[PDB]
Amino acid sequence: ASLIYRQLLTNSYSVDLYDEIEQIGSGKTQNVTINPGPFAQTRYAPVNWDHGEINDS
C-alpha cells in the first residue's frame, strides 16, 4: 500500500505532460456547432408603413 506514494512521485512527470495537454488543447481550434432545431424560424417580411390608396380625380 506504500506503493502509491512511490507511484505518485515517480509518475509526477505526467503532471507536466497534462499541463501541456490542456494548455495546447485550448490553443487548438474547437467549435461546438449549436444547431437550429428541427423546427425552422422565419420572420414576417420587410414591412413598411404608408398611407393607403387615395381617391384622386
Binding site: Y44, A45, V47, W49, D50, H51, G52
Partner: protein, 48 residues
C-alpha cells in the same frame, strides 16, 4: 357627404402594437362618435 357616403382615415404608428400588425386573425375596436362641422367660405367674386 351623406348617409350614403363613407369616410376613410389611414393611420399608422411606430409602437410595438402597431408594428406587430403584419398577420392578423381578428382586429376589433370601439371608438367615440364625433361631430364634424363645416365652416364658412367667402366665394371671392370680382363683381356683385
Amino acid at each position: 357627404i351623406k348617409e350614403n357616403s363613407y369616410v376613410y382615415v389611414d393611420y399608422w404608428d411606430d409602437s410595438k402594437a402597431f408594428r406587430n400588425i403584419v398577420y392578423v386573425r381578428s382586429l376589433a375596436a370601439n371608438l367615440n362618435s364625433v361631430r364634424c362641422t363645416g365652416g364658412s367660405y367667402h366665394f371671392s367674386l370680382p363683381v356683385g
